[PDB]
Design a protein around this ligand. Sequence first.
Ligand SMILES: Nc1nc2c(ncn2[C@@H]2O[C@H](COP(=O)(O)OP(=O)(O)OP(=O)(O)O)[C@@H](O)[C@H]2O)c(=O)[nH]1
Ligand SMILES: Nc1nc2c(ncn2[C@@H]2O[C@H](COP(=O)(O)OP(=O)(O)OP(=O)(O)O)[C@@H](O)[C@H]2O)c(=O)[nH]1
Lengths: 394, 394
Amino acid sequence: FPVVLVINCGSSSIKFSVLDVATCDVLMAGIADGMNTENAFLSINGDKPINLAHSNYEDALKAIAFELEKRDLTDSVALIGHRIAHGGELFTQSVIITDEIIDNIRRVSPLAPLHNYANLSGIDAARHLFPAVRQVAVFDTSFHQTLAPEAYLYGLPWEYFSSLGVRRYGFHGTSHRYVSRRAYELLDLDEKDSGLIVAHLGNGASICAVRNGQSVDTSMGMTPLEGLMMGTRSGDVDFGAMAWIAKETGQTLSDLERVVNKESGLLGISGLSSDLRVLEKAWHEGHERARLAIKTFVHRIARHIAGHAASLHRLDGIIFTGGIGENSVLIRQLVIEHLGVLGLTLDVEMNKQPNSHGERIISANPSQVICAVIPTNEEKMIALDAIHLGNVKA
Amino acid sequence: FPVVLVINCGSSSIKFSVLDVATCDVLMAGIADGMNTENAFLSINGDKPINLAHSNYEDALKAIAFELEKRDLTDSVALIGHRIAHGGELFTQSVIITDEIIDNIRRVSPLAPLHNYANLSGIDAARHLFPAVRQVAVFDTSFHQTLAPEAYLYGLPWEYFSSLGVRRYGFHGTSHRYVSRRAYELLDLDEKDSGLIVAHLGNGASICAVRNGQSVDTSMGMTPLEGLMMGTRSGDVDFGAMAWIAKETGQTLSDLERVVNKESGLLGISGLSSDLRVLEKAWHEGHERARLAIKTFVHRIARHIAGHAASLHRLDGIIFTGGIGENSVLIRQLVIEHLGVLGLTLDVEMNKQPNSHGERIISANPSQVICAVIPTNEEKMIALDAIHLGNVKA
Ligand SMILES: Nc1nc2c(ncn2[C@@H]2O[C@H](COP(=O)(O)OP(=O)(O)OP(=O)(O)O)[C@@H](O)[C@H]2O)c(=O)[nH]1
Ligand SMILES: Nc1nc2c(ncn2[C@@H]2O[C@H](COP(=O)(O)OP(=O)(O)OP(=O)(O)O)[C@@H](O)[C@H]2O)c(=O)[nH]1
């Protein structure tokens, strides 16, 4: 009974999961938080949170590996999946990790300095601790590589694209891809003759237009900062405004980068929280700035959904996913009502149902476009890629 | 037979027009270019281009005033209209210019340092040369003041909006308003139950959603830099990308501001021209980068049109206007074809007709949304506001 070890090695943490090869069920999950600081702690699926003083990525993954030994799962690890944040233009699909792949990730690493160097550290660690195990790289950008130049070029001088690689890459590719496949089943659509809009909504939020199985437009850009307004991220912001603030307040680009990434968004407007649950209660309790933050959030999602629809020949489905897209009765209601122009009709009893109801259609029959909620499973999509690449003779 | 003198006092030029009060026909037009430099020249509607060595806004407007004396039009100037670029939050409509209005324009002037201080210079000049004449201020921003907070707030910290005035203002308001009114007649729509998308397309380009007579969304932001890709302007650009370029190339915000405003857009991608006529011929002649510039241009327009449709309850019309929107058979074709998802059907024989055909519907009967071209007349809209305010007892 073989298993897959999925690793998301972030800048401050290491998210891991162990999935059974046969059924793709989660058998174990956890997180190693506070990475590189004096206080680094390992936590396993809600159980006892252990500790490690000033531990790096290699020893933290070794701590996780010790726990796989304890539950006799080490010998069963047949495949390892790595989430990589940025794959540049080089990666269009998931790959078996070799010396070539490592070099290529290093080549595109300047495009995401925070995310990617942590991913490489996770690769080296897993390579050290599991040398006889096939390892797979799954990229957040790869699904969006089917974008046409008209859809990925910025209006900048050509030089920036040709010599520096400045262009739209987009993210949540694993999720957008996973949720796309599930939508063809749920909505009984032909993949080769379909038009979908996936609204991945969480702490990070992005929209994707999936035409005939392929991503044709996405809301995030070169960095995860473009598009929708998010938890702490601003989203689409007038550069003229950003330059105006720079002169007026006397702030540098790196100061504003911090503000736009960690002090903005839902947090920025409300002045209260980046968490929707807190903000939803706040609005119910008559908080005005929380109402505005959520309304602006909703408005920018509706705008990007409708905008990405333009890249489709025909709109068959709108799919909600992510922590917010799966669990927010209100946000889904407000977004769909904001898109009445497209002929959407919501079924509120179906929209009331909690996420325990899993893959569910939330639109009424007279609606021109089917609306649904599909719980995203990024770990399953990584595992499925690994299992596929497990049959490959290298 | 009274006349109206319309003045657009830009940073490098002074565009003027003389319109008859009764019919609103143009009787005289011209431009005073190269303002403040050693070489400043007055040109009148294609006729002999006179000169003036190192002339300021006051003397240049006096040169224009001398020509009004020559053609015996000075005594007939009953009203003067001023185009103002930025009216902040203070101006929701056109006003009779008084000491209060001047102060208020000065108050909001930091929001547009280039545009507004030139507008004030034009006001002072016209006040000096025509003291007994009623003068009117028409603002580029005022039509967009009906925007809801959800539509004008950025995802920045609240402080930037509350204390600094950072928010979406939008521009081309005079044009968007003018073209809106004309569309109700042409499309036989009830103003109070209508949904329009106006695509003002020129060297500067913006989209506006006009719901029930009011602007509810617009593509430009705090500055004219946000939204669509334009002639020399980039449009929507990932700030993360802008910050990345800053570190990599070693450029300041003011360097990048120049690049994004004057070296980007259609010029930036093609590396050839900001003019569409040149680029359209270039593509016909097999130029690849000109094809890409136009395709990216088209894609970003389609995306914003469809996006702004979300702010409408029902989409009755899409209206093209501006130098490009009025004269580009190709761009209109490519944009409408890019919006097939909305159920648009183009009539190509009707779309082939040149601008001499004026206000014209270009969509076929089976189309779900009426498409039209309405020639914009910003001078007429300024004159009509002035004539209205001419009946006002102050
Ligand atoms: N309304 C509501 N919101 C919820 C609920 N549960 C979680 N959320 C929201 O979901 C968000 C977190 O979602 P996640 O998908 O886990 O965010 P993330 O994984 O850090 O971000 P991404 O990896 O980019 O998707 C938080 O901001 C919560 O406010 C819920 O039960 N109701
Ligand atoms: N294809 C095509 N384009 C034209 C034609 N005539 C003008 N244009 C384009 O229209 C653009 C200029 O339009 P304008 O409306 O005058 O631009 P502008 O007034 O400086 O900019 P705004 O004030 O923001 O509207 C140029 O880029 C030209 O390429 C034409 O006959 N055919």
